[PDB]
Amino acid sequence: SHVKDILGLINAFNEVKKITVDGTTPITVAHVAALARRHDVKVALEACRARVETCSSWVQRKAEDGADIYGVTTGFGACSSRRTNRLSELQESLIRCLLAGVFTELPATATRSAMLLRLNSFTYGCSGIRWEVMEALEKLLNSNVSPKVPLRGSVSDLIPLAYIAGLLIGKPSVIARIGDDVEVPAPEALSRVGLRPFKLQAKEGLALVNGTSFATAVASTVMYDANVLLLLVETLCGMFCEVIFGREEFAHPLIHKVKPHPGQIESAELLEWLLRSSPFQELSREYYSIDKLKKPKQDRYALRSSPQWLAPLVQTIRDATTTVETEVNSANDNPIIDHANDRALHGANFQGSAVGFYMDYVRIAVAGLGKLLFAQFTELMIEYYSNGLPGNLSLGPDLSVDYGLKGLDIAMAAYSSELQYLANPVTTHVHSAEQHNQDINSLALISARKTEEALDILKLMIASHLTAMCQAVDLRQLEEALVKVVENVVSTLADECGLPNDTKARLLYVAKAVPVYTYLESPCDPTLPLLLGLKQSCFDTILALTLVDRLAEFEKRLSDRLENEMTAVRVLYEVRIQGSKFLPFYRFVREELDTGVMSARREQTPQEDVQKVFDAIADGRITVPLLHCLQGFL
Amino acid sequence: SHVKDILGLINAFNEVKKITVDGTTPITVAHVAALARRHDVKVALEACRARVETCSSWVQRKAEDGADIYGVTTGFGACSSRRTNRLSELQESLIRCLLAGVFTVDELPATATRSAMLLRLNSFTYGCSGIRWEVMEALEKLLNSNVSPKVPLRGSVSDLIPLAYIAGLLIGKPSVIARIGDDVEVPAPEALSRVGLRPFKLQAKEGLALVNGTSFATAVASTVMYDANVLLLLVETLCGMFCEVIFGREEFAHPLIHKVKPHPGQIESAELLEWLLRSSPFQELSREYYSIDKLKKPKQDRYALRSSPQWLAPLVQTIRDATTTVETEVNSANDNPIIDHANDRALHGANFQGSAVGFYMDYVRIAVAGLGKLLFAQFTELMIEYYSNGLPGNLSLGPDLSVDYGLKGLDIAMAAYSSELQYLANPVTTHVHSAEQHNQDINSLALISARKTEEALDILKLMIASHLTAMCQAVDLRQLEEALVKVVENVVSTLADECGLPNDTKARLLYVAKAVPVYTYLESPCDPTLPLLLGLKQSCFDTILALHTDTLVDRLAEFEKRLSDRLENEMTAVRVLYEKVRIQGSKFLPFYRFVREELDTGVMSARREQTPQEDVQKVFDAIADGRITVPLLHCLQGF
Amino acid sequence: SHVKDILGLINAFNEVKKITVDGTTPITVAHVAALARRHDVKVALEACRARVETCSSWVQRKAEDGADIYGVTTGFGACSSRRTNRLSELQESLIRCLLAGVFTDELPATATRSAMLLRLNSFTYGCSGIRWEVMEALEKLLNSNVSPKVPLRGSVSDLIPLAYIAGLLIGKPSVIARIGDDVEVPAPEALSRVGLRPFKLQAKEGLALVNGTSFATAVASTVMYDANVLLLLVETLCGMFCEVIFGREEFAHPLIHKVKPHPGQIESAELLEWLLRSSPFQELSREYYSIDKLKKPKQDRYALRSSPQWLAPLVQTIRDATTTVETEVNSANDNPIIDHANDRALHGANFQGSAVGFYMDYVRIAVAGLGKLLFAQFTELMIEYYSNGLPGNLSLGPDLSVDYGLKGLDIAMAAYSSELQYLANPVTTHVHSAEQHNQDINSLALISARKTEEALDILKLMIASHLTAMCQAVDLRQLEEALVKVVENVVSTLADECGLPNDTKARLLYVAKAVPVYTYLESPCDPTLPLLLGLKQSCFDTILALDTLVDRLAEFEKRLSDRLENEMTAVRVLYERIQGSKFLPFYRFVREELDTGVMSARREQTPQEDVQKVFDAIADGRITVPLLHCLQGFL
Ligand SMILES: *N[C@@H](c1ccccc1)C(F)(F)C(=O)O
Ligand SMILES: *N[C@@H](c1ccccc1)C(F)(F)C(=O)O
Ligand SMILES: *N[C@@H](c1ccccc1)C(F)(F)C(=O)O
């Protein structure tokens, strides 16, 4: 199951201390994301040194012998017919030419990831780069030194990679970060870490720039996030079922066996397990047993069609992860040196098309994830579709001065709207580039950036959705306690007023049946559903059988006693979640993040509450409640 | 290799005679495509009959006894609160309300309709639907009798409305029109009459069972994926033919390049290309071409060739993965509720949701746009003298280029094809509306997406037809070129002797004859301002300085005058003769031979009366009807 | 007002008999659309003849004397450096080269005839150098219904498709021509049948024939005609929507729009205020919000209330693009441009279809906006929570469990809007560097025009469904009014017969007035439905406010049960305000002229059959008759 694979990724991200780069051990998207985001994570380049030096030696010696090899004794790109013996000058003129970006930047996280991925490519021993340059890359990475790199210019990653090469050769115009607090010209940065500027040998300029390292770097953290957010969305579908009073049957194994898309079986299998012994599903069964024939037979699509919907999304995100990791673990470079067979091989491994195309697909899948969240949120906000919950999840009781999560609802539409726009492909906009030499190009970095922007929005949407669901948990729990009060007040008052058994039964059924949030604002308002039902019953008990006096007295005593006792339990409140598999999420948001039920009495704005949830998602603290919730699933 | 899988698909499409529909043998995209396109292909429903009858009687009993089951004793969609014991009228009312398409005729074609009927029939064999076996038999008979309802093109968010027309046929709705063969349209009651059927009266759940499926989206996706596989393999293969005509370096496909960047589609496409180009007579000429003035010529090829395996990689993987997804849907019970009669429950879910097909249709349309762009880039290089390594601009034979613009028209159309294709590849799946009284707040739009991908494939067929036609032109131009260069050499060689020129002059002159691209001076071989006589003049001056007399100058002047007399006549003669060989040793011989001999074409020029349309039309027709798979299979023989 | 301009376009489309082509008289999009669609419309080429022959003469002379002029003594496109004195063969080689489309699908005859018209018109300016006699042949071909069959694709904007018209004129055997609707013959037989002989191309003539924007602009012209008509139609139907939904017409108040004065906002609101002023339905709406006022919405939802703000950019986009397309229709889209007066061949790019291209992209986005408005309005009309008394799906019932009303149309509306939104992505953002990199910018105007055309097909579908639904809503509103009165009468008369106190009678009559009738039509005396539910509350209340009374109330309840349903069934059967409404022409056209009725289980015709009739009438222009009646007297 993909659920195991994603939990494996989260663990790896959390547990990795050293990333060994040795030409053989795979680097995963978790390793890359951990390097980028956790400063205590170090690179360990393992002396594959033998194959690096052989390749390096082969390239320099052949170049000096005057062998005819692209970009070592020839011009670059469309200029490949020009030959030269100016070995170092050739390489230097390439870097000069490629220092061509403009600051209107790629972040340090991306840049460091690119540095790791370039270093990794070199370990396969096809590049002809010197071992010493690799050691400098490892040292730069572990010292938190990174060039400032312009955002744009790559069609996929010559220009952005030229800034890493610029740093390594000490270009004065290249600015490097040393940690978060220091910016200095490249020569000063090299000095401060005990390095001297390199003099480029044969092929070294080209080897440093001819990779897919920036596209693949952004794609790696994109894929790590996409896996985690994917699992988070699937899991939260179960919380949605619980708070909305869904029917868990939608996740029944036979439904999905019979339409066996792997993502459909696996998401449904997770959802069946999450909901198996749910206290909230127990309430759901109670709810639909009261006036069963006046209530929906099935849930609406946002819940009931969730496994079918998630299926291609799971599969796209899983497959794209494989593709990105293949790219991470590849010699993306040209020429490829086949030193064992005494030849340089001319091809196009710099071409980031596998990554670019899959970036387009994943952005579409992320939009699909956003649409599901938006549809669920919309249902949650509308009393007609929420099975007893108040509109906008407004606690009130005075709804005229409590518009609940309406702000969050509007924002969800804005989030989804922009997300859907972002999901158009980048890959269809291929221009014939670089003197028409690059007449196909992947645009993978640009695509990766757009998928990253899409995920930023998805994070906003998940934070909002989780926050609303926590609100909804409190509201369901308050609902149960409120209904018990109403029943108790109705029962005891019927006794006191000495009403017949016929009467008491009719009134207690009303007290159990009418949704409490329809009348919470003013419980004894004669135009609201509680008293409406009560009056209906009282007339019926009169037709079926002083009795009038005892009924009028009941209605007066209820008018005096009920709202006060409802306010009491409400104020006290300001439990079923204790038995829910989603307890860790509720406990995380309420206790660890220090929040409470949302209302006019709570001073914290929706911003303040959703910001905490969002920050926990952005920095990965959300995986703790996620891993606790999933504990024991196999 | 995906290459084996696609060859398998093609074999299955050509060879199948009966599609067995039995609830356990899988139906592939090739079977669907063969049913749709080959009218000798028949459906065989295999009496799964037991579980089907158990299911339908289970549903009927439960309903009669008043069991609470969605869409059987319950209103539909957003109205599922409403209960009824009006079992047949409930189902009748669903069909009436769903007969809501409009003919703009634009319609779903018979091919997609018949495919959809097969897929619905297939879903039913899993015994989860509650449909009567006799309705299933009716579907088999309609299929085998070539009777199809006429179905409006639009209305589905994925396939209630379109499927309602098949249901409408079965119950004899007079407003539903039916095809019988290619030439007859009659009202539904008459169509049933003509094949020995009586209108059905819908039992509990039967109206819903007929309409609550992904049959149309999946029908169009099936023929889309079949075509996408074939066209993909064709594009991959023709990359090798492009290498041969453009004078590429086959090194780009070396197995080590790709082992070291091991995307499965990258390795497998490069593996195919290495095989296609091993021992190529055209690659031999390429090696010779670059050995002459080596240092004045590009060390590497441009991206459209050299980066083809890296470009193809995701395209191969998307198309292969989508085929699996679509076939999983073909072989599914897409219906709701799902009757688990063994455990006496009707399970309420959403197997009618075509999201798997919808999202993959979007991915594939993107992959197809990538295939179009690859063809457009390759075609572009071929038309431009600066990038074609000796070929004339526009692949114009001429020799008078002022009245022969060659394949320029095709070049223009290729830009028009790619442009619209890139536009089409925007996603459909991002346009989800909250539908059906906000009941369907997510919906796949799979049929809409599948239609756009089909449109994308129409354009790709056009591009492949053009590209293949151009490469056959280029084959002829390369073969004529080799012949013309040999004549220039002979004339220069013998005339050098006969004019009594020194051996160092003769050798200089013969170098020029070998090194100058013949198509740069074919228009007028002895024009003093064109590259042949340019080089000859330089060489003649250098000779005078090197051997530095009046006799030398007389003989050199004589050489120029006599070349002026003879060379054009000789060059004209070999060209005319050619219009009246290395491809014989090429793995692409079956393509060249198919286009030239079987389709009856020739080198394009001002002397050929057939227009580019007429030539490309033949190739396009062969791609459209599958005849192109014959040279594809011959070419790939032994791989 | 744009409303007046569109009415002007409609009248011209309907009334034109002869399109005058003379180099000075403007050709409008209505003229193009009428030629395309009404075959009784003829072309009158007015012998501009003198400037044409002068320009023609100039070119032939200059070419024969070996002047250096692009595409007359030089090669084409990227090959312009080649010179030749083979004047006719040069022109012939161009056509040969451009006969390069494929039949997969074809540009329709309507578009091809429009393209022939536009090319002929371009020639009248006397910049092209084409012979007068070729122009007469084009006029004759137009007037005789002869058209080449033309491949759909190949143009980046229109060399390849125009080469088919040139191919017809020179009698290329491989070019197939239509004669009327049924005859298809090779080009030389077609020419022969209308008494023409094949032209032999003179200097520049091949190029003049192919070097225009005629196909993009043809399709764009019918696109813009339809866009104007359908726009006005959607704007107008917003008023009809207000009437059936129980809208508040104040949304169209002139001060609101004076204060945010986008011209399209002012003008659509002005139209809507006029359509809704003293409406009988607005009077029903006013009544509705007066009953339990404080429990009903103070404002309408956006699909109505925000309609003039929404329509504003859409009106403006469609009007400005009409101007732009007409400027193209009336242009010398050719190259070189011959300035015979000053003896210069001017080298430019009037073949570049970019004005049309970008505007087709804009219009497609605006059409998507119109579709979205219709979708949102239709969605509200189907949902009881938002329709202010109307049944879900506009189901008549009474038994809703066997009547799902217009739910099928509702699903289809989502499908239509969805695909329409996708179609509205731009084509102009996909410019490829084409034709040996000579055409490194190109308009793609024909492709874009085709997509806008496709988007308008869907809009037609959406308008047809919406209008059908609103007619259903008219019937349901009038039936509602008749039903409430019936219930009020039955309640009143039965209160008297049971001798109920005035207090009781008053309470019960208010329930009869207040409860939306469609919430209980299914079973009027079901004790779980809103009527008897309201009646029981009032009965308990009257007992508190005041044992023989109980007897009488129990007798009222039994009598109502005997009587109410039958009285309601009778009025409904018989039925199976619009007379004072400005939308009467639309209702009458759909119900009477198209022969339809309220939708229910008892009517055999399917939703398809009803909507097809309405769609066909939109498609062929018959919809403009009720539209013009509805708007009579406006401004
Ligand atoms: N990646 C291409 C290139 C172009 C310009 C400068 C450096 C590199 C290339 F295709 F030419 C290559 O490096 O192989
Ligand atoms: N697919 C949905 C439906 C809606 C309207 C008519 C028939 C069917 C459904 F979700 F409600 C279902 O059938 O499950
Ligand atoms: N439109 C261009 C052209 C190209 C090929 C054939 C005919 C015309 C042109 F720009 F070159 C022109 O005609 O001006």
Curated annotation (Swiss-Prot), chain A:
PTM note: Contains an active site 4-methylidene-imidazol-5-one (MIO), which is formed autocatalytically by cyclization and dehydration of residues Ala-Ser-Gly.
Top-level division of the source organism's lineage: Eukaryota
Alphabetized InterPro entries for the sequence: Aromatic_Lyase (IPR001106), Fumarase/histidase_N (IPR024083), L-Aspartase-like (IPR008948), Phe/His_NH3-lyase_AS (IPR022313), Phe_NH3-lyase (IPR005922), Phe_NH3-lyase_shielding_dom_sf (IPR023144), Taxol_Phe_23mut (IPR031008)
Key words, A-Z: Alkaloid metabolism, Cytoplasm, Isomerase, Lyase, Phenylalanine catabolism, Phenylpropanoid metabolism, Taxol biosynthesis
EC number: 5.4.3.10, 4.3.1.24
Biological process per Gene Ontology, one example term: L-phenylalanine catabolic process
Subcellular location: Cytoplasm
UniProt entry tagged with the keyword Transcription: no
Active-site residues per Swiss-Prot or TrEMBL entry: Y70 (proton donor/acceptor)
Activity sensitivity to pH: Optimum pH is 7.5-8.0.
Function statement: Phenylalanine aminomutase that catalyzes the rearrangement of L-phenylalanine to R-beta-phenylalanine. Catalyzes the first committed step in the biosynthesis of the side chain of the alkaloid taxol (paclitaxel), a widely-used compound with antitumor activity. Also has low phenylalanine ammonia-lyase activity and can catalyze the amination of trans-cinnamate.
Family: Belongs to the PAL/histidase family.
NCBIfam families: phe_am_lyase, taxol_Phe_23mut
Record's protein name: Phenylalanine aminomutase (L-beta-phenylalanine forming)
Organism: Taxus chinensis
